[PDB]
Design a protein around this ligand. Sequence first.
Ligand SMILES: [Mg+2]
Length: 47
Amino acid sequence: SRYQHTKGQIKDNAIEALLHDPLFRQRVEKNKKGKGSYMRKGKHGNR
RNA sequence: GAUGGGGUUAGCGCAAGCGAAGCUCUUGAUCGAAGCCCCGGUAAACGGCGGCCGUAACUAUAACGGUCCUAAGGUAGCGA
Ligand SMILES: [Mg+2]
């Protein structure tokens, strides 16, 4: 099962190259309560 | 042609010599323009239009950066 290498024709280091493409992104939690937190409509919504 | 330095000298002295005046060879003081230097301009005047090193999500490149040098570092376009 392939991954479409955003980098393409990988010549030198495969690991490093991959780590520098969308597959190993910087992933950020959308936490509640604080900063970058507010949701207009919740997961289940207002009742 | 300023001065200075001679040079033979009417001579005077008993004489080494001083060497009147004048004569006269020099010395170039001063006077003294253009140009040159110098200041600015001009490249459709003649001409000239850089190096070295480092750098970005594999690699590669380097928009970018450091530095040195220049009068300035080749712009548009074009380009084995
Ligand atoms: Mg050919």
